[PDB]
Design a binder for this molecule. Structure first.
Ligand code: HEM
Ligand SMILES: [O-]
Length: 154
């Protein structure tokens, strides 16, 4: 469960394209997440009322939230596995305050992969998607371990 440097470079090469417009990517990822797995939207007290994709796209608060998620995830990815410090606050808030199960982290990982596959075929072929999946699996494995330490089954 340790990524090679070549795998990390495939992850970071597609993430650089995400960074051309992190806000737009965040909107697409949230829309995909909520339309593939509607139950996840219920965890968001401020966004749970959104009824349609048009409302999600027009929500300035949701756009800002997407930027926060992707920027936090980008900082984790750029540590190339040395993300202990970054996972501490994230694991605590998601376990104890938002109460986000591991299955829901799997759902957002799937939404990320789906959106990168659609938007970035030039940097998200099979090998690149495999590397991104490995990076997200590592993130989820380490978050799950921290969840257990914090008292949350997940
Ligand atoms: C890649 C995985 C994720 C990352 C990097 C991430 C990151 C963040 C960050 C940085 C924040 C703001 C600070 C904080 O409260 O920690 C946040 C808030 C939040 N997260 Fe996540 N998150 C992820 C997955 C999820 C998922 C899958 C859900 C629910 C299905 C979720 C639910 C929430 C909620 C409800 C908030 C508070 C939102 C608000 O203030 O309106 N998170 N997340
Ligand atoms: O989030």
């Amino acid at each position: 469960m340790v990524l090679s440097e070549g795998e990390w470079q495939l992850v970071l090469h597609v993430w650089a394209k995400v960074e051309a417009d992190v806000a737009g990517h965040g909107q697409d990822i949230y829309i995909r997440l909520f339309k593939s797995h509607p139950e996840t939207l219920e965890k968001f007290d401020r966004f749970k009322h959104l009824k349609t994709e048009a409302e999600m796209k027009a929500s300035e608060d949701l756009k800002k939230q997407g930027v926060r998620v992707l920027t936090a995830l980008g900082a984790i990815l750029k540590k190339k596995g040395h993300h202990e410090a970054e996972l501490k606050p994230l694991a605590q808030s998601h376990a104890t305050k938002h109460k986000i199960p591991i299955k829901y982290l799997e759902f957002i990982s799937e939404a990320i992969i789906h959106v990168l596959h659609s938007r970035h075929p030039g940097n998200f072929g099979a090998d690149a998607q495999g590397a991104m999946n490995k990076a997200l699996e590592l993130f989820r494995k380490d978050i799950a371990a921290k969840y257990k330490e914090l008292g949350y089954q997940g």
